[model samples]
Target: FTMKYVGSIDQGTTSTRFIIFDERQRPVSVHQVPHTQHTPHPGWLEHDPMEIFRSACKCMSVAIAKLRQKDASFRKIEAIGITNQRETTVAWDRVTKEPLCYAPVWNDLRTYDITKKVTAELGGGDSMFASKITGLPVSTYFAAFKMRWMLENVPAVADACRRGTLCFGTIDTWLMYKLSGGKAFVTDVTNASRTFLMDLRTRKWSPELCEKLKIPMETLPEIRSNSELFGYVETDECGVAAALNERTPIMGSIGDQQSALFGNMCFEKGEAKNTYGTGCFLLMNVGEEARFSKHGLLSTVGFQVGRDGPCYYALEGAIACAGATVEWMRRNMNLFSHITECEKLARSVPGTQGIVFVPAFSGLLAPYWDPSARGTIVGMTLKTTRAHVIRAALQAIALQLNDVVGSMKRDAGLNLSSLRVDGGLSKNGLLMEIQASLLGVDILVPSMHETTALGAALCAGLAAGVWTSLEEVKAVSRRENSWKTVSPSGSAMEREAMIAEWREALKRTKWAK
Candidate 1:
């Protein structure tokens, strides 16, 4: 019964989870708690910082207790890793370490006015002005925009800033601060890379950006590598420290998408993963050199394993909708009575019957960046039934990914080796097969779910010596998990014809003004 274990705090948009994994890379015990979503105004989303921290604590204590009950030999977690929803920013007093206000989420559009002004003034009417330095365009999704909004809008935050008692950080920084009893004010590079304040190449905060953005450099946390020692859990909140039994080092911290990248074992260039959640996040490793995008895609620091260790770069893109389209047909459109029947109905027809559905209800993102594009359906003949429409929705999702992958290939100057798929939508067999045929690469779906949590655990394990190298981590996963490979089945002529129709349908989506 001699085994080592690691725990990962998967702090997501809606819920928080603590999952403990055995040395064999299997999740042994887990617990999750959902926190409240605060939306005081339209186009704004906020989260109570204290509530999120408590939810994390509660999940950890409960998970550890359950593990001890299941395995008598279970002792202590060698290290704890953290993976969180990136760009949701928090501001607090340096003295109190308490939140100044509810933290603004990444999707919050409260900074739209500021975003435009920044792009016009500092960016010289181009959002890509700082893209070379930061690898991010001036967008409301980044932490610096959220931080700037806080200082200009919130009185308490402004007062803290003027008094020189302000501390700004992402959720990872907040959790580490609370867990360490306010001892550590640090963040990992993956999280830092999303801030817009950090340089992509140097992997440090840029003084020029701070001066131009009017954000004080003093408020930011020290950026560290993802797999290094951040801090130790010192707080006894929810009796978590006592439940931990021994002092546990917090050795890993990464953003959720990148965590999934590591968890999927995309360590080499051209290896990629596409997570099909409410939306799709596609990231492909582009090796050590940072490759800036010619298309609208993002160039990002994928992961840095150790302190001053070799850094890997990636090309990232997203789709505004993936599984959301599936749910839309079931609930809103009344195309199906149940979620289970979605695939069945789509499969009832051989093909979409000359109809194409573009599920751009929320506008198109990534590769196209078309905000004026709305949901569209073209070439809908009288023969088109609900079955064809349902099937068209699935094909639309795959088509968007194909375009995004096309952009990534051009930007990174590398072809995608294979695509590792995850999230709820990955369970659909038809969708995976369609995706494989279009991309002409194998789509790998892992039997062992929770790849995001596994990524953080792997980072922690590597630092804590639970697994020595990336090869060992990969070996354990290969030995423990089974993978289902979806290969391309369509012919070249058929694929070319399908893409031609898709291109024509995309031309009709520009209905929004």
Candidate 2:
């Protein structure tokens, strides 16, 4: 049978999803398995490494089985592409392939102290010296501090590092290692950039940064281009049984947010996309030159098409909380039964009714990298209802995006013409309207909102020779729908006044320390 499908394994923060995209880049079959988030301590989040791997395997098998049942000819999966949550630290025994400890999730702030220590030991906090090299601030969000903390605090991890039997990886590398029968221990440039250990110049783990963090160079994963064949999948690697015994080539991989950026086809310089996943990540393509942020933004690899060619650059801003804020309202406040209800509640009000919710639940990221900052709801009154609060929460998501876009424009010296948006929360029309209105720019929502999966599939297709180049991939990308553009209807004074109030609310949520 001719190759007709590309299976994408989207290993996200909350779930493992297997999606098969046809030649036209439309999802034909999808299966998702939600994983558990373990909070053994306050301010710390973890995941069972084995459980995530097993769930991924199960989801892949189930998705392929369903596709085969629909049409026996669907069995020909051309390639497998992987995109995953970045910066979630995992260390394993090289020989046994067993995790030394639970995977430290991206949300985990256990390394805040370590970050502080590193900042103090290195130089003045948030100084040019710090930003020039690492292209990121000292924060618990990045993986370097977490890796250092694990080495010093976790005995097994320490022992493994000492014995040179350890292999450290973000979720992509961890998954790749398991999927390739422990033969492939590597990560894409996009994923490597998030570790805070990688030098933007070298596109590899920085020896100087590693020395500062007190982490051994031996534990790091080998870096690879975003779109390249890393290794071949072995039969023994997949725990689940499958019909095809031949080793499938593991072609392309990237961090989920960067994958969304690529999938959105922000190929040209100055083009940008915002992914509203668990967190809202906005990445603006800066082309081959690494544009360091003057504001609190990150310089990261957008995607690398070739091993020897210059990588596409991006300026990134992370909100640290977006969809999860709504999840919090559901589970903690009991305000709504489903996330969709929050949308309905938000649209009931014209605006937030003077209320503003700064969702610094863990800590503020992006333009405001305040680790000690906490979430706050400002300008509340007895007249306020759940609808107003919900609206404020949704607006907060847009407001955060506004902060990022404003900073990105200032740093890059380019006005954002429009924004291509995708992900779960981007499905909400009300939210998209608010986002467009606040930014005073058009927000383009593609037909395929699941761009993360589409991106991985596109990379795999490119690698497998199904798609030849970016132009060919673009031809296959379908534009299903777009939200009605919401122009700034309010007067300049009115918009400015509202922004002023937002700034005040933002100040109220600043780190107390």
Candidate 3:
């Protein structure tokens, strides 16, 4: 038999990428293209839908061409998987087959007023009123709020709605629709859960929430499992369809974070992963049953393999600054000249020297849920140097993660079995060591850092029979990939001291109000 390959479209917030993986799950060739980020106001962010779609196509063709150069045997990818930045909503018309307006990104804050109104009016002054069903609080980070904002503000969107030709979807649905030449209007379970309209238990759009939120059901897409065949790529944009030269089916669809979870092999209960990007996203698998959070974390769908397959659930938490904190020290604070120096300087000091830095520049999220919290450093003295401050910052990031993990343990009633680390900041050994010591768990860092892209590929590969089952996928990964293990090394008393200082520093962060 000839060798098989799978392709993944990793459409992120800033850029789009196409990565092809061989049967061994190694990335063979890849290409990336960036799109525009339109910020009209202080708290508003938007993206041109067509620009994103074209970027995806461009990536596909370039990556395919590059692969042909490297490997003469590669003919076409078996299937395509899509993993995208979740919660970013797109509005389009059915007949025009075009976006009505620029999509409001997940971080856009223009929905704040509407969020408060919804919480007060519909949620009875509590954001978690519908959390039991949606597994999310009425936050602006969700897609349904963005959908509501578009319906109220955009005339074109309203017109489409009135004409009964409106379609609303997260980034995954939007990409699948455009790639299929508008034939597929389906979303995977992972992406659908982020809409704040899907019932977490049923995995279907909640009509009661839709009516209460004033969003028409007709605007939504059919929800499907992440691994099944959604549609075929028929678009000729950037010659992507022709480059494939085969009727490549789009077989995988998942949200970006969950894709990482799958890519890290966090399939069993209590398995977890923490991605340290610009911000930190930590997700812990809670098994087949969905578990709601009471400590300000979001409950979300982890992943589903095939149609009617057992679904895994997760509890998620976010820290607004991880890599951003390192950036600030270099650019804003002038504490370091290079990214590498941040880690070097941090390790230069034995410890923070009785100091704690709370990098809450954008306020605290998850567990604390304190919007009034501001960045603050306590116990700084003339003896302290930039080394201490930088080390303190790293400690702060790890501490926040520890708190999030504590909350997850409580909410899920399961201890984190282990944590798989990825993303930009995961390369920092100092940070990873500190995190491992505090969490008191083994941290596994994969050499194949393209796990997120590999995740979508695995879904497609599984569906295409490129690999028969999850066991085979795991076995192949073990045989083909190398992992570096970071184990806890600090004393218990040292951990106790760090936690004590962190608790005191947190109290001083409530300065915004």
Residue 28 accuracy (lDDT) in model 3 = 92
Q: How high is the CA lDDT of each candidate model?
A: 0.89, 0.79, 0.90
Model 1 lDDT at residue 235: 90
Report the lDDT tens digits of candidate 3 across residue range 309-422: 999999889877888988898999999799989989888878888999998998988699998998899998899999999999989988888998999888888886889888
Tell me the TM-score of each prediction against the true structure. Answer: 0.99, 0.91, 0.99
What does the lDDT come to for candidate 2?
0.79
Off by over 4 Å in 2: 1-3, 123-128, 237-241, 327-345, 350-357, 361-363, 371-373, 377-386, 479-488, 491-493, 510-513
Model 2 over residues 343-406: C-alpha lDDT tens digits? 8887877776688888788777778767687889899889899989988887777777788877
Query: Candidate 3: worst 10 consecutive residues by lDDT?
Result: 271-280
Q: Candidate 3 versus the native: TM-score?
A: 0.99
Off by over 4 Å in 3: none
**Tens-digit lDDT string for candidate 1 (1-513):** 577989999999989989999998999999999998888998789999999999999999989999988997987889999999989999888897789988999888899988998998888888899998889888888999999898988999999888999999999999999999888999998899999999998877888998999888779999998898999999989988888989999999999999999999999999998886545799999989898986778888899999867899998897768889988898899988987888998988899878899999988887889889998889888889998998999898888889988888887888879888888888989999899998899988899988999999888999888899998888888898887999988787778877899998898898787
Which runs in model 1 stand beyond 4 Å of their true positions?
none
